[PDB]
Amino acid sequence: NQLKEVFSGIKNSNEQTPEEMASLIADLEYRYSWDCSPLSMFRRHTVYLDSYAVINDLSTKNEGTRLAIKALELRFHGAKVVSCLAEGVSHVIIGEDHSRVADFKAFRRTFKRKFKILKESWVTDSIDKCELQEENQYL
Amino acid sequence: MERKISRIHLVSEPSITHFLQVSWEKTLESGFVITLTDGHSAWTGTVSESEISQEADDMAMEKGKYVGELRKALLSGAGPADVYTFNFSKESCYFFFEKNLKDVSFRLGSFNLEKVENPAEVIRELICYCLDTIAENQAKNEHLQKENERLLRDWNDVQGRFEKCVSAKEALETDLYKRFILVLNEKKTKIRSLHNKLLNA
Amino acid sequence: MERKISRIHLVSEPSITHFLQVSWEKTLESGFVITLTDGHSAWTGTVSESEISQEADDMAMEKGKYVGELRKALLSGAGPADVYTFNFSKESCYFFFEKNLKDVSFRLGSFNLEKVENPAEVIRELICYCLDTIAENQAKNEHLQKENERLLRDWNDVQGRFEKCVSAKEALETDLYKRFILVLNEKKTKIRSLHNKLLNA
Description:
Helix content of chain B: 40-55%
Distance between the termini of chain B: 103 Å
Structural class of chain B: alpha+beta
Protein name (chain A): DNA ligase 4
Domain BRCT (chain A): 37-139
Shape of chain B: rod-shaped
Subcellular location (chain A): Nucleus
Organism (chain A): Homo sapiens (Human)
Order of helices and strands of chain B: EEEEHHEEEEH
Oligomer: part of a larger assembly
Family (chain A): Belongs to the ATP-dependent DNA ligase family.
């Protein structure tokens, strides 16, 4: 009750940016080893989705499939969903369509940092366990 | 290119049904071709823009209203309360339809059809068209049912995930508050220890 | 009662196509009734359980395979690699069908049919059944389309609800964390000041 009353005292705080909030959250989790929580483990990992017919295009959305709901659930669980294929991406989810696996592999090879190829079933299995399942069986 | 097949009861022999097929390109206004059959012999005729326009002018009726009435009568567009009576004099090869209106009958259309020498060809063509359309309808129904089943499964999955998320929201909130109070109590202990050490010093 | 119509092109008359309707109550194992026509004449026959059993005994082959082959051929179930050839002789009133494979044809079955008194009734019932089935298919398609529209609306509503829920969760989490880190920063400033003033005393 005292904590709630104290929090009600503060009016608002919008002096920062989402990237700053993500960095601060990661810093606190690392400092206090709070990675055991039922959510927020995916915060440390950026997630990209193959929801575009043409990679790196914002005018060819494929909304209306399981991919959108999967991305929304990943964001809810704490995953940082990224709409741009930057070199900092660490996780990529590919649905039943494996036509562009070669393109993703080529991009991973070109980038200095390699992001493991993952499937949509991996997150579905992991959510029930609430833990980061090994990517070797879902590569 | 569209065509409609309808059933009719000729007043001359109101015991055996007949089938009339009317086909048009875009609308009945420009014209159409009609074919009457009974399973043994068939007759065919055509109506052009000039003929329909002349008939409408003789009727002193608006072209749109006449076209709508013709569509209702010929394309089996029966309304809530309206009866149309057709009859085809075979001897004179004259087929005409009227709008029976409770003891006052208003003749609607009339044409002269020519007895086609070959009825087998037209009957076979009608059967082929019927089979093609039924096959297309069956395929469309199957595809639509499959899509509906898939969408229902997806909706069920999404609803379950939404229930799980809303259930876990409160758990996340309470866990966050508990962790907050834990670390705050740790900081209170730290400040208390520092104050005690300063007092001792 | 289930009846199915199909088209067969006799080798004798490839140009002309014949329409055959097979009607069975529950299964073909108990026989059925087959009526063939070409638009100008018709023939009818029965393969009642006794006839099919006798034919199977004559061929000395498993009943299941025979019923499967009948389903493939008569009901237009022939696969892309499977070809069935039918031949009907009106003079002998016979009709025999076989399967052609590897350039050799193996006899599948043969029946005897009796010409009907008049084909007009057969054609009329065929057309009436086709029209009724077309109307039923149209109604089913309309109902399925309405249900699909309802499914789309429900899916859109659920997606909007999920988006709202995730947005609310993110907003609550970020606000709580911002407030908490502000409090932690203030407490850390206070403890730093306490430590700084501890040294002098």
